[PDB]
Design an enzyme around this catalytic site. Structure first.
Site, PDB file in Angstrom:
ATOM      1  N   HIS A  43       2.540 -49.106  51.633  1.00 52.96           N
ATOM      2  CA  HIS A  43       2.923 -49.326  53.020  1.00 52.96           C
ATOM      3  C   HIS A  43       2.817 -48.054  53.862  1.00 52.96           C
ATOM      4  O   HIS A  43       2.489 -46.983  53.352  1.00 52.96           O
ATOM      5  CB  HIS A  43       4.343 -49.900  53.098  1.00 52.96           C
ATOM      6  CG  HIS A  43       5.396 -49.009  52.511  1.00 52.96           C
ATOM      7  ND1 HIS A  43       6.138 -49.366  51.404  1.00 52.96           N
ATOM      8  CD2 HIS A  43       5.843 -47.788  52.886  1.00 52.96           C
ATOM      9  CE1 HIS A  43       6.996 -48.402  51.123  1.00 52.96           C
ATOM     10  NE2 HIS A  43       6.838 -47.433  52.008  1.00 52.96           N
ATOM     11  N   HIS A  95       4.133 -44.710  52.601  1.00 54.27           N
ATOM     12  CA  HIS A  95       3.351 -44.063  51.552  1.00 54.27           C
ATOM     13  C   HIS A  95       2.110 -43.472  52.204  1.00 54.27           C
ATOM     14  O   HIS A  95       1.697 -42.359  51.885  1.00 54.27           O
ATOM     15  CB  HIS A  95       2.916 -45.081  50.492  1.00 54.27           C
ATOM     16  CG  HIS A  95       4.047 -45.665  49.707  1.00 54.27           C
ATOM     17  ND1 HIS A  95       5.324 -45.145  49.735  1.00 54.27           N
ATOM     18  CD2 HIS A  95       4.089 -46.714  48.852  1.00 54.27           C
ATOM     19  CE1 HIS A  95       6.102 -45.849  48.931  1.00 54.27           C
ATOM     20  NE2 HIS A  95       5.377 -46.807  48.383  1.00 54.27           N
ATOM     21  N   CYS A 151      24.968 -55.606  37.381  1.00 55.93           N
ATOM     22  CA  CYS A 151      24.497 -56.971  37.569  1.00 55.93           C
ATOM     23  C   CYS A 151      23.885 -57.423  36.252  1.00 55.93           C
ATOM     24  O   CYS A 151      22.908 -56.842  35.787  1.00 55.93           O
ATOM     25  CB  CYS A 151      23.446 -57.047  38.674  1.00 55.93           C
ATOM     26  SG  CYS A 151      22.663 -58.676  38.762  1.00 55.93           S
ATOM     27  N   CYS A 190      20.087 -58.326  36.471  1.00 52.01           N
ATOM     28  CA  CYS A 190      19.242 -57.152  36.634  1.00 52.01           C
ATOM     29  C   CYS A 190      19.287 -56.235  35.414  1.00 52.01           C
ATOM     30  O   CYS A 190      18.265 -55.691  34.998  1.00 52.01           O
ATOM     31  CB  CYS A 190      19.690 -56.351  37.859  1.00 52.01           C
ATOM     32  SG  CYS A 190      19.303 -57.095  39.457  1.00 52.01           S
ATOM     33  N   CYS A 198      24.689 -58.637  44.648  1.00 52.82           N
ATOM     34  CA  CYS A 198      23.448 -57.984  44.247  1.00 52.82           C
ATOM     35  C   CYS A 198      22.306 -58.348  45.192  1.00 52.82           C
ATOM     36  O   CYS A 198      22.156 -59.509  45.573  1.00 52.82           O
ATOM     37  CB  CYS A 198      23.081 -58.399  42.817  1.00 52.82           C
ATOM     38  SG  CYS A 198      21.412 -57.931  42.270  1.00 52.82           S
ATOM     39  N   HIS A 230      19.102 -61.961  43.128  1.00 52.58           N
ATOM     40  CA  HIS A 230      20.057 -62.858  42.486  1.00 52.58           C
ATOM     41  C   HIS A 230      21.223 -63.199  43.412  1.00 52.58           C
ATOM     42  O   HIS A 230      21.836 -64.255  43.279  1.00 52.58           O
ATOM     43  CB  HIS A 230      20.589 -62.224  41.194  1.00 52.58           C
ATOM     44  CG  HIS A 230      19.514 -61.689  40.301  1.00 52.58           C
ATOM     45  ND1 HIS A 230      19.531 -60.404  39.800  1.00 52.58           N
ATOM     46  CD2 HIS A 230      18.384 -62.262  39.825  1.00 52.58           C
ATOM     47  CE1 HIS A 230      18.457 -60.210  39.056  1.00 52.58           C
ATOM     48  NE2 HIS A 230      17.745 -61.322  39.055  1.00 52.58           N
ATOM     49  N   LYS A 240      14.201 -49.326  62.174  1.00 48.18           N
ATOM     50  CA  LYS A 240      13.556 -49.201  60.874  1.00 48.18           C
ATOM     51  C   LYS A 240      12.741 -50.464  60.600  1.00 48.18           C
ATOM     52  O   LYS A 240      13.233 -51.576  60.781  1.00 48.18           O
ATOM     53  CB  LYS A 240      14.608 -49.006  59.781  1.00 48.18           C
ATOM     54  CG  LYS A 240      15.337 -47.674  59.858  1.00 48.18           C
ATOM     55  CD  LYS A 240      15.424 -47.011  58.496  1.00 48.18           C
ATOM     56  CE  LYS A 240      16.792 -47.210  57.879  1.00 48.18           C
ATOM     57  NZ  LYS A 240      16.772 -46.948  56.417  1.00 48.18           N
ATOM     58  N   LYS A 274      10.978 -56.963  57.486  1.00 51.07           N
ATOM     59  CA  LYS A 274      10.475 -58.324  57.598  1.00 51.07           C
ATOM     60  C   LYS A 274      11.235 -59.103  58.667  1.00 51.07           C
ATOM     61  O   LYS A 274      10.653 -59.540  59.661  1.00 51.07           O
ATOM     62  CB  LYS A 274      10.605 -59.043  56.254  1.00 51.07           C
ATOM     63  CG  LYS A 274       9.915 -60.393  56.199  1.00 51.07           C
ATOM     64  CD  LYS A 274       9.035 -60.514  54.963  1.00 51.07           C
ATOM     65  CE  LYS A 274       8.438 -61.907  54.845  1.00 51.07           C
ATOM     66  NZ  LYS A 274       7.161 -62.038  55.605  1.00 51.07           N
TER      67      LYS A 274
END
Ligand SMILES: [Zn+2]
Length: 500
Positions: A19, A22, A127, A130, A144, A147, A297, A300
């Site tokens: 993205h 990076h 978790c 996880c 979490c 999940h 920031k 989505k």
């Protein structure tokens, strides 16, 4: 032996689609490297991918693929991405490589034998789905992230690194080296954390929980978790122990990071190097966040995300790199958009640079018989040879926007020059003067193209090709006036920056 440059970008999580964040850090490293290669520096530019961990492991298990085979294919999305951005890195380090494993185990053994490692218990939010620990902030309001289930307090046997013992030393080291953490603002934030106990560092997890990773030399039932794994890449890529590269480059190590991973690089990393017997890096250079167009920031839900690769296919790799280097001050949070990039492209590139080149070419065919005129003094344009020297310190201090603003400032001066002298009018009176004016423009562009090479490698080489100048260059050539030779120019050359 003298001019040595080593730059690293963080090692990026493999199962993460490349993205803007990076792209930016990598482009800045590429620019820094290309520039130094141009300044006659023996340079090494490193980048890579973080491939161990349980998330990656479970993702491979899902696709019914072998862990090694999985990271092997997905790590390539980064190589492909860097190929598109025109990143000329010297090495691409992958944490699953043997050379890396060898160095991690080697530093682990040395530190374990030094008594800085002990077995203990880690406690905190856990978790069960996880099989990983979380912190307050990491929890999306109680539950979490994935999940979306409640976490419970749990303990787990982990090996620790006595990091606290090194706090005193680190505190003072930063106090003695005010240039360590480049952007000043950030240097004051690290000192604030060192004011309070930093605690010990958990460096492993049971293979039962994390089967994917590098085993501890003294306990194969455990796997190196994150820190002593990803961080050591900077040293692993240099064949650290007996490697020539380690001896040459490590002493000048420049680390480029985003503020999100500042604690790991400013606190953890320096103490691990200390305990390992490895010299401290030269500089930690912190970049800010590239905020969405709404000054928020990227994300989505907000739909304010900006994809660099989509933007790259629209305006080209060269335009993207220029926009990010000229428009975003390194170290400060700055919003980005497609509108800001289109404006810079229209003004700076398509008009100020592209049109001047197209204009000069048309005028050489008409007033100079399709060849570069005989060299002449630069007059008021000769001052440009002093740009390389004024830019060198600007670049080293992470002031890329100011550097390019200066180079383009000269390009604007070139435009005004030819628009004022008006060579098509001076030709009627004195042809020799018209030619003189044109030579100064081609030679002025030669110098400009050199200064801009690190930002737009392909386009600047194209500019020289289009003006019959020498393609491959060196920054020193931008410090002497009169280098452009009188040779024919290609009968036909494509528009440098087309209309979009
Ligand atoms: Zn979970």
């Amino acid at each position: 032996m003298e001019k040595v440059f080593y730059v690293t970008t963080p090692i990026y999580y493999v199962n993460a689609e490349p993205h803007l964040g990076h792209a930016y850090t990598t482009v800045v490293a590429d620019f820094l490297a290309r520039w130094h290669r141009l300044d006659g520096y023996r340079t090494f530019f490193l980048t890579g991918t973080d491939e161990h961990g349980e998330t990656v492991y479970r993702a491979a298990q899902a696709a019914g693929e072998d862990p090694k085979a999985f990271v092997d294919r997905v790590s390539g999305r980064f190589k492909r991405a860097w190929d598109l951005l025109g990143i000329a890195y010297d090495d691409f380090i992958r944490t699953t490589e043997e050379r890396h494993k060898k160095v991690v185990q080697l530093v682990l053994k040395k530190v374990y034998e030094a008594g800085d490692i002990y077995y203990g218990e880690y406690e905190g939010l856990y978790c069960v789905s996880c099989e990983r620990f979380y912190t307050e902030k990491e929890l999306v309001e109680g539950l979490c992230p994935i999940h979306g289930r409640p976490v419970e307090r749990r303990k787990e046997g982990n090996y620790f690194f006595r990091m606290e013992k090194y706090r005193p030393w680190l505190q003072e080291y930063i106090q003695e080296n005010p240039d360590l953490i480049r952007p000043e603002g950030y240097r004051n934030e690290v000192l604030a954390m060192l004011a309070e106990p930093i605690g010990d560092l958990s460096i492993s997890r049971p293979k039962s929980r994390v089967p994917w990773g590098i085993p501890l030399p003294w306990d194969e039932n455990h796997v190196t978790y994150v820190w002593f794994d990803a961080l050591l890449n900077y040293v692993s890529a240099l064949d650290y122990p007996e490697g020539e590269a380690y001896r040459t480059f490590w002493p000048h190590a420049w680390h480029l990071i985003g503020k999100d991973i500042l604690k790991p690089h400013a606190v953890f990393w320096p103490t691990m190097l200390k305990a390992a017997g490895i010299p401290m890096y030269r500089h930690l250079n912190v970049g800010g966040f590239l905020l969405g167009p709404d000054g928020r920031k990227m994300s989505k839900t907000l739909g304010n995300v900006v994809d660099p690769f989509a933007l790259l296919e629209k305006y080209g790799r060269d335009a993207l790199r220029y926009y990010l280097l000229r428009e975003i001050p390194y170290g400060q949070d700055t919003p980005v958009s497609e509108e800001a990039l289109r404006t810079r492209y229209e003004a700076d590139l398509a008009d100020d640079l592209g049109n001047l080149v197209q204009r000069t070419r048309a005028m050489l065919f008409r007033f100079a018989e399709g060849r570069i005129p005989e060299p002449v003094a630069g007059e008021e344009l000769a001052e440009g040879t002093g740009l390389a020297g004024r830019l060198r310190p600007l670049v080293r201090e992470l002031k890329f926007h100011v550097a390019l603003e200066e180079a383009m400032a000269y390009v604007k001066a070139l435009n005004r020059y030819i628009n004022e002298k008006k060579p098509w009018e001076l030709f009627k009176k004195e042809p020799e003067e018209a030619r003189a004016v044109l030579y100064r423009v081609v030679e002025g562009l030669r110098i400009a193209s050199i200064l801009l090479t690190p930002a737009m490698p392909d386009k600047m080489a194209e500019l020289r090709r289009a003006l019959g100048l020498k393609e491959e260059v060196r920054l020193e050539e931008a410090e002497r006036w009169g280098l452009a030779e009188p040779r024919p120019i290609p009968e036909e050359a494509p528009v440098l920056f087309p209309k979009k």
